[PDB]
Design a protein around this ligand. Structure first.
Ligand SMILES: O[C@@H]1[C@@H](O)[C@H](O[C@@H]2CO[C@@H](O[C@@H]3CO[C@@H](O)[C@H](O)[C@H]3O)[C@H](O)[C@H]2O)OC[C@H]1O
Length: 189
């Protein structure tokens, strides 16, 4: 089990962040593998991938994802200049993160239609400190916990709709939770 922070493990970048609440354990395993076990957590996000990401990576993921409450399983990352937190959401628990958000299009990729949304975070943590910034979402209609994500299809559809990305920072397959419980074991490549 590891400290919240970032680094490399078995050739993969990882990021593990939480709000200090307790109730979440994050572990790095062999190769591109990581696990998360959580029970009455606060907020957290963790997983493995790349630093920096790219705008045409094909990301493969495999494993098991068993949320009990509010959680997402996503390709997750940031850009800088502009600061953007983005998600290609492959599965989630009790809450669809696009609830209440305005739909800005659709994209078909990797066996499913996805719906596209923009939201905004106001004075929230980020890779550069507390900030107000937009979030971009592609939400998969057909939920799954293994597959392949052609990120270019998403980034190109976002750009088409006016959701432009700056310079890529990290890019991971992440489990996120918000005051929930669950378990997950995911392998990235
Ligand atoms: O020490 C600093 C780190 O703590 C910081 O980490 C980032 C903090 O913001 C995190 O993003 C939140 C995660 O939850 C969302 O979905 C929210 O909308 C965000 O506010 C991000 O995951 C962490 O990487 O990075 C900079 C360090 O100085």
């Amino acid at each position: 089990t590891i400290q919240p922070g970032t680094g490399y493990n078995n050739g993969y970048f990882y990021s593990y962040w939480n709000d200090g609440h307790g109730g979440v354990t994050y572990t790095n395993g062999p190769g591109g593998q990581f696990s998360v076990n959580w029970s009455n957590s606060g907020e957290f996000v963790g997983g493995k991938g790349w630093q920096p990401g790219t705008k045409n990576k094909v990301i493969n993921f495999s494993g098991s994802y068993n949320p009990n409450g509010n959680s997402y399983l996503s390709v997750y990352g940031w850009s800088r200049n502009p600061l953007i937190e983005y998600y290609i959401v492959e599965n989630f628990g009790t809450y669809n993160p696009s609830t209440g958000a305005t739909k800005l299009g659709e994209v078909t990729s990797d066996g499913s239609v996805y719906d596209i949304y923009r939201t905004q975070r106001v004075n929230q943590p980020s890779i550069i400190g507390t900030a107000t910034f937009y979030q971009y979402w592609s939400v998969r209609r057909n939920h799954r916990s293994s597959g392949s994500v052609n990120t270019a299809n998403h980034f190109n559809a976002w750009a088409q709709q006016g959701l432009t990305l700056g310079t890529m920072d990290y890019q991971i397959v992440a489990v996120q939770g918000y005051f929930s419980s669950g378990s997950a074991s995911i392998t990235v490549s």
